[PDB]
Amino acid sequence: AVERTLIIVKPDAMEKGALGKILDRFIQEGFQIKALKMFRFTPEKAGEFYYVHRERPFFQELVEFMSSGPVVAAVLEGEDAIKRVREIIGPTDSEEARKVAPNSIRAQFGTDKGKNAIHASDSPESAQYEICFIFSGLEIV
Amino acid sequence: AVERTLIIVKPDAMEKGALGKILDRFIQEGFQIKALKMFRFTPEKAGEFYYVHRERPFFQELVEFMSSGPVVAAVLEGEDAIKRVREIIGPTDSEEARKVAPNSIRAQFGTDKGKNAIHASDSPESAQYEICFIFSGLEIV
Amino acid sequence: AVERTLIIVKPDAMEKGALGKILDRFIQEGFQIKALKMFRFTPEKAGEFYYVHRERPFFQELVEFMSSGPVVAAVLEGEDAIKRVREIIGPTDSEEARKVAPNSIRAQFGTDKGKNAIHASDSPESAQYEICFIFSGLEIV
Amino acid sequence: AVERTLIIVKPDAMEKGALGKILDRFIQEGFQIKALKMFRFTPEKAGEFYYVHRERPFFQELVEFMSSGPVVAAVLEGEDAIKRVREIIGPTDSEEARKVAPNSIRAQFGTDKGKNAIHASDSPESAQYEICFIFSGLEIV
Numbered sequence: 001a002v003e004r005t006l007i008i009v010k011p012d013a014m015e016k017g018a019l020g021k022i023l024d025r026f027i028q029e030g031f032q033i034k035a036l037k038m039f040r041f042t043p044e045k046a047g048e049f050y051y052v053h054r055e056r057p058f059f060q061e062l063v064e065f066m067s068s069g070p071v072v073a074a075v076l077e078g079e080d081a082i083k084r085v086r087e088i089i090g091p092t093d094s095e096e097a098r099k100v101a102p103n104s105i106r107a108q109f110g111t112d113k114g115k116n117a118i119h120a121s122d123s124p125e126s127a128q129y130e131i132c133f134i135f136s137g138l139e140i141v
Numbered sequence: 142a143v144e145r146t147l148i149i150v151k152p153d154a155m156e157k158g159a160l161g162k163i164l165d166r167f168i169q170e171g172f173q174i175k176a177l178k179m180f181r182f183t184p185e186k187a188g189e190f191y192y193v194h195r196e197r198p199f200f201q202e203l204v205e206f207m208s209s210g211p212v213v214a215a216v217l218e219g220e221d222a223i224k225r226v227r228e229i230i231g232p233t234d235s236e237e238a239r240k241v242a243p244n245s246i247r248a249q250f251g252t253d254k255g256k257n258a259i260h261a262s263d264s265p266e267s268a269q270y271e272i273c274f275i276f277s278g279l280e281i282v
Numbered sequence: 283a284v285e286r287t288l289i290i291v292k293p294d295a296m297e298k299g300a301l302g303k304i305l306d307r308f309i310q311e312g313f314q315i316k317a318l319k320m321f322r323f324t325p326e327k328a329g330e331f332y333y334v335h336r337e338r339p340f341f342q343e344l345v346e347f348m349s350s351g352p353v354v355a356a357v358l359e360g361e362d363a364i365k366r367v368r369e370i371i372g373p374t375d376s377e378e379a380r381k382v383a384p385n386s387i388r389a390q391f392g393t394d395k396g397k398n399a400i401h402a403s404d405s406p407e408s409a410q411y412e413i414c415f416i417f418s419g420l421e422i423v
Numbered sequence: 424a425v426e427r428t429l430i431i432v433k434p435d436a437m438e439k440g441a442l443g444k445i446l447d448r449f450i451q452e453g454f455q456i457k458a459l460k461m462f463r464f465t466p467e468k469a470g471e472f473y474y475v476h477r478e479r480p481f482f483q484e485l486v487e488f489m490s491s492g493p494v495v496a497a498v499l500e501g502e503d504a505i506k507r508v509r510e511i512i513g514p515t516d517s518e519e520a521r522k523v524a525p526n527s528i529r530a531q532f533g534t535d536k537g538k539n540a541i542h543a544s545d546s547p548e549s550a551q552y553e554i555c556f557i558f559s560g561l562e563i564v
Contacts, residue, residue, distance in 0.1 A: 017450045024443025033442070036495060038459035040564040042324065045279060070564040072459060133278035138186060141463040141493040158309045165302025174301070177354060178319035181423040183465065211423040213318060282322040282352040327561060419556035420468060 003081040004034065005121045006130040007089075011069035012115035013105075019072055022105055022118065026076055029088055035075040035135040041067040049133050052126070061114060073134045082127055085120045092116060144222040145175065146262045147271040148230075152210040154258040159250040160213055163259065166246065170229055172217040176276045182208040190274050193267075199255065206255065214275045223268055226261045233257060285363040286316065287403045288412040289371075293351040295399040300391040301354055304400065307387065311370055313358040317417045323349040331415050334408075340396065347396065355416045364409055367402045374398060426504040427457065428544045429553040430512075434492035435538035436528075442495055445528055445541065449499055452511055458498040458558040464490040472556050475549070484537060496557045505550055508543045515539060 007026070009019055027033065041049065046067040053059055076085055090097035090104025094116045097107035110117040121127035148167070150160050168174065182190065187207040194200050217226055231238035231245025235257045238248035251257040262268035289308070291301050309315065323331065328348040335341050358367055372379035372386025376398045379389035392398040403409035430449070432442055450456065464472065469490040476482055499508055513520035513527025517539045520530035533540040544550035 017447075019456070020443045020445070020447025020450055022443070023446060024440075027440045027443055033461060036459065036461035038456060038564060039279065039562075048278060132273035136277045136280070137189065137274035138180065139277065139462075141461060158306075160315070161302045161304070161306025161309055163302070164305060165299075168299045168302055174320065176320055178421075179315065179317055179423060180421075280319075280321075282320060321561065330560065414555035415560035418559045418562065419471060420462065421559070 002077060002079055003124070003127070004075050004077045004131060005082045005085050005127045006119075006134060007074050007076060007085065007121075008066075008119040008134075009072045009074075010115070010117055010119060011065065011071060012111060013109045013117035014070060014072065016109055016117075018109040018117065022109065023074065025088065025105065026074070026085070029078075029084070031076040031078040031081060031085070033074050034077045034141065035131075035139050036072070037074075037134065037139070038070055038072045039134075040070045043067045049130070052129070058114065065114065066119075075131055075135060075140065082121060082124060086122070089118050089120050143218065143220055144265065144268070145216050145218045145272060146223045146226050146268045147260075147275065148215050148217060148226065148262075149207075149260040149275075150213045151256070151258055151260060152206065152212060153252055153256040154250045155210060155212065157250055157258075159258065163246055163250065164215065166229065167215070167217055167226070170225070172219040172222060172226070174215050175218050176216040176272075176281045177213065178276075178280070179211050179213045180275075181211045184208045190271065202255065216272055216276060216281060223262060223265060227263075230259050230261050284359065284361055285406065285409070286357050286359045286413060287364045287367050287409045288401075288416065289356050289358060289367065289403075290348075290401040290416075291354045292397070292399055292401060293347065293353060294393055294397040295391045296351060296353065298391055298399075300399065304387055304391065305356065307370065308356070308358055308367070311366070313360040313363060313367070315356050316359050317357040317413075317422045318354065319417075319421070320352050320354045321416075322352045325349045331412065343396065357413055357417060357422060364403060364406060368404075371400050371402050425500060425502055426547070426550070427498050427500045427554060428505045428508050428550045429542075429557060430497050430499060430508065430544075431489075431542040431557075432495045432497075433538070433540055433542060434488065434494060435534060436532045436540035437493060437495065439532055439540075441532040441540065445532065446497065448511065448528065449497070449508070452501075452507070454499040454501040454504060454508070456497050457500045457564065458554075458562050459495070460497075460557065460562070461493055461495045462557075463493045466490045472553070475552070481537065488537065489542075498554055498558060498563065505544060505547060509545070512541050512543050 009022055043063055046063045090101040090106040093113045094106045094110025097104045101107055105118050106116050121130050150163055184204055187204045231242040231247040234254040235247040235251025238245045242248055246259050247257050262271050291304055325345055328345045372383040372388040375395040376388040376392025379386045383389055387400050388398050403412050432445055466486055469486045513524040513529040516536045517529045517533025520527045524530055528541050529539050544553050
C-alpha cells in the first residue's frame with residue numbers, strides 16, 4: 001500500500017554536505033516528499049522523539065548526537081515506503097553497509113554504527129509517532 | 142488520568158473578541174496550555190480535519206465556516222481533560238447551552254448550533270488525531 | 283498610521299495564569315491579533331532576540347528568565363499601535379506602574395522591574411526586527 | 424561579506440524531481456543552508472510575497488504558478504551569496520541559460536521564462552524581505 005515514513009538526515013551527513021544527494025536518491029527511487037524541514041532538536045526534544053528507544057542501547061549518545069547540530073526531516077510517501085526506505089538506507093552499521101549494499105545511503109555517507117548518516121522509521125507504528133513528532137498535518141503538502 | 146485535548150476557537154468567537162476570555166477560562170479551570178497558535182485552515186485542510194463529518198448534514202458549510210477566517214487552537218492538559226473541557230464548553234447547540242449551562246463557553250459566546258464558538262476533541266482517539274493535525278511534537282512546550 | 287507591534291507574555295505572567303486576561307485586554311483596546319503562538323526560546327535565541335541589551339546590566343538574567351519556560355508572542359495591529367501598546371502595558375518597573383497606571387498590564391500582572399509580565403516593541407524599527415524574529419510572513423493571518 | 428539569500432524551488436522543478444540536485448549544487452558551491460521548508464503558498468500569500476513585483480510584468484501568472492503546487496524554500500549563507508546564487512541559477516530565460524551557462528540551474532532544470540525552476544532574491548533589500556516572509560528567526564538554525 002501507499003505509506004508514509006519519516007527520514008532524518010543526521011548531523012554527520014549534514015556536515016559531509018550530503019543532504020541534496022540523499023534527497024535526490026529518494027526522489028529517484030519514486031518517493032513523493034510530503035514535508036521537509038531543517039530544525040535543531042533541543043536535547044529534551046530529541047529525548048522525546050526517541051522515547052521508545054529510551055530503554056534500547058545508546059540512548060544518551062543518540063540524544064546528544066541528534067541535538068548536536070541541525071538536522072533535516074522529510075516525510076516520504078510511496079508504495080511500501082517504510083520497508084523500501086529501510087532497504088535504500090542499508091544496515092545500521094555503515095561499515096557493514098559498504099560490504100553488502102555499496103550504494104546504500106549508509107554505505108555512501110555513513111561512518112560507523114553511530115554516525116550512520118540517516119534515521120528512518122522502523123515500522124508503521126513508529127512512522128505514525130515520528131511523523132507527528134516533527135510535522136503537523138498542516139505541514140503536509 | 143492526565144489527558145490532552147484540542148480546542149479550536151472558531152471564527153465567530155474570534156470576531157466577537159472572545160479569544161482571551163476563552164483562554165482565561167481554561168487556565169482558571171486548571172488546565173495547562175501545552176501548545177497555542179493562530180492559523181488559517183485552507184478549505185482542503187478544514188475538510189481533512191473534519192473528514193469524519195464528510196457525509197453528514199452541513200459539512201460544506203462547516204468547511205467554509207472553519208476556513209473563513211483565522212482560528213486559534215490550543216492543546217489543553219489536565220486530569221480528565223477531555224470530558225472536563227466538554228463540560229466547560231457546553232452543549233453543541235449554543236441556545237440549549239444558555240438554558241442548561243449559562244456560564245459555559247457556548248452559552249457565553251456561541252450563537253447557534255453551527256456558529257458555536259469552539260471545537261473540542263470528543264475522545265482520546267480523536268484528540269490524538271486532531272492534536273497531530275494542528276501541532277507537531279516540536280510545538281508542544 | 284496603522285502599525286504592527288510585537289508583544290511577548292513572559293514566563294512570570296504565564297505562571298500567574300494571566301495570558302488570557304492579557305490577550306483580552308488588547309482585543310478590547312481595539313487591536314487585531316495578526317499572529318499568535320506559544321514557543322520556548324533557547325538561551326541562544328533569547329540572546330539573539332535581545333542582542334541590543336548584550337552589554338547592559340542583567341543581560342544574563344534576562345536571557346535565562348526569557349528561556350526559563352514557554353512564552354506567548356502576538357503581533358498586534360492598529361492605529362498608533364506601538365505607542366498605544368506601550369501605554370497599555372505601563373512603566374517597565376511594575377511597582378511604578380501600580381503607582382501611576384493601576385490598570386496597566388504591568389501594574390496588574392508584573393512583579394518588579396525584571397519580572398514585569400510582558401515585552402512590547404519600542405519603535406517601528408525594533409518591531410520590524412522582533413516580529414520577523416518570531417513570526418514569518420506565512421504566520422501572519 | 425557573508426550574506427544570506429532566499430531561494431525557492433518552483434513547482435516545475437519540483438515536478439521534474441530536481442529538488443535534491445538543486446540543493447546539492449548550492450551545498451557544493453560552498454553555501455550553508457540555514458533554513459529549509461516545503462510549504463504551499465495560498466494565492467494570497469504568494470501575492471504578498473511578490474508585493475514588490477505587483478507592478479512588474481506577469482504578476483498574476485507568477486502568483487498563480489507559485490501557488491499551483493508545493494515549493495521548497497531555503498536560506499543560503501555564504502560570501503557574496505546574493506550575487507553568487509544569481510550566477511549559479513543563470514538567466515531568467517531558461518532557453519538563454521542553455522546558450523550561455525549550460526550548467527546553471529535554469530539551463531539544467533528550467534523550461535522557459537516562466538517555468539524557470541527557481542527563484543532567488545535579487546538584492547540585499549529583497550533578501551531581507553523575502554527571508555522574513557518565509558522563515559522567522561526561530562527557524563534559522
